[PDB]
């Protein structure tokens, strides 16, 4: 039993280590990130989450990047500046992966890009997986 | 209501456009490929599918590349060479994706690469999605 | 402490069927098969000894 899982749960690159690709999520009703490390890290690497709105010139092209806001849960406290962020700990081994997702949608496009671009940033890869088709 | 889809259906990069990355399918019981274009194509691009055995000197590392053999279905015929291959046609638009997978597992690692490396191959991206885990 | 370190699962018992494509009035052909599986459970419930 092997399935064509790509039909129902497609995945798209979001950060290949040198460039960031906006990923459209309008046609799907869930999504989540997946982080992988290809080499041992030397320090913590934080990531920033953005989102885009449809461009005025063309409704099929994204606009400038906006920053996702924070949404506190019933336990815990809000972020210092109230904006979502992701931090990959130094303990991550080359042979393991991490996964996390945002509680809310906001715009129809999403993206992720590191706070700083350096030799330690190229040692990571990020991918986005959709889970449901509404069309 | 969002979900952490990255926990149940992790996705991994396979062909970012300039390099091929082995993907370990050992820990999961299904998988599949997803092809996406980022710029217009000029001619059909064929892809080769491989699999790797465990390396002799270290089980942590994949071995050499081996082609995946074909498995004919009930009412059908085998390929001319007997091996598995995938072809991305010309009509694919930049806003669409294609998904397909092999019927059998073979080795524990998997890989994919274009038959020839040129200006056309760099315009395609490949990602691997995997179903529930087993450990 | 087996019964928690490893599990064994069976799906159906062996079945035998006669094949109409190879059978004649002078011959017979039988087909058979079965299904089963197994998966490790807890990794902390066992140990292994080796020479060193």
């Amino acid at each position: 039993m092997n399935f064509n899982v790509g039909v129902d749960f497609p995945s798209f690159i979001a950060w290949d280590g040198t460039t960031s690709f906006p990923v459209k999520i309008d046609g799907f009703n869930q999504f989540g990130f997946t982080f992988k490390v290809i080499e041992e890290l030397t320090a913590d690497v934080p990531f920033n989450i953005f989102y885009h709105e449809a461009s005025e010139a063309d409704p099929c092209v994204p606009g400038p990047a906006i920053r996702v806001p924070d949404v506190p849960f019933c336990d815990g406290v809000a972020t210092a500046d109230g904006l979502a962020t992701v931090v990959i700990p130094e303990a991550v081994a080359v042979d393991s992966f991490c996964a996390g997702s945002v509680p809310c949608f906001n715009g129809p496009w999403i993206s992720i890009a590191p706070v700083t671009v350096n030799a330690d940033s190229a040692k990571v890869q990020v991918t986005v997986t959709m889970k449901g088709a509404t069309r | 209501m969002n979900f952490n889809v990255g926990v149940d259906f992790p996705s991994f990069i396979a062909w970012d456009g300039t390099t091929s990355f082995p993907v370990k399918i050992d820990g999961f019981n299904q998988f599949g490929f997803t092809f996406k274009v980022i710029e217009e194509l000029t001619a059909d691009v064929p892809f080769n599918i491989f699999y790797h055995e465990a390396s002799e000197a270290d089980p942590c590392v994949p071995g050499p590349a081996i082609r995946v053999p074909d498995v004919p279905f009930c009412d059908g015929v085998a390929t001319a060479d007997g091996l598995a291959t995938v072809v991305i046609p010309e009509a694919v638009a930049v806003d669409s994706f294609c998904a397909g997978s092999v019927p059998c597992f073979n080795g524990p690692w998997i890989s994919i690469a274009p038959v020839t490396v040129n200006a056309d191959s760099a315009k395609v991206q490949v990602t691997v999605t995997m179903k529930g885990a087993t450990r | 402490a087996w019964k928690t370190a490893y599990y064994a699962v069976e799906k159906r018992p062996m079945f035998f069927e006669q094949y109409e494509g190879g059978s004649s009035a002078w011959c017979v052909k039988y087909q058979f098969g079965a299904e089963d599986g197994g998966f490790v459970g807890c990794c902390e419930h066992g140990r292994v000894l080796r020479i060193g």
Binding site: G100 | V7 | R50
Partner: peptide
């Protein structure tokens, strides 16, 4: 804020951490 879920490794122990046994007690 996001809570990252991670798994130990792709392999249970890609290089299994075999360990010597406790040394013999005494004479």
């Amino acid at each position: 804020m996001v809570s990252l879920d991670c798994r130990n490794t792709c392999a249970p122990a890609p290089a299994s951490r075999l360990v010597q046994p406790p040394c013999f007690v005494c004479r």
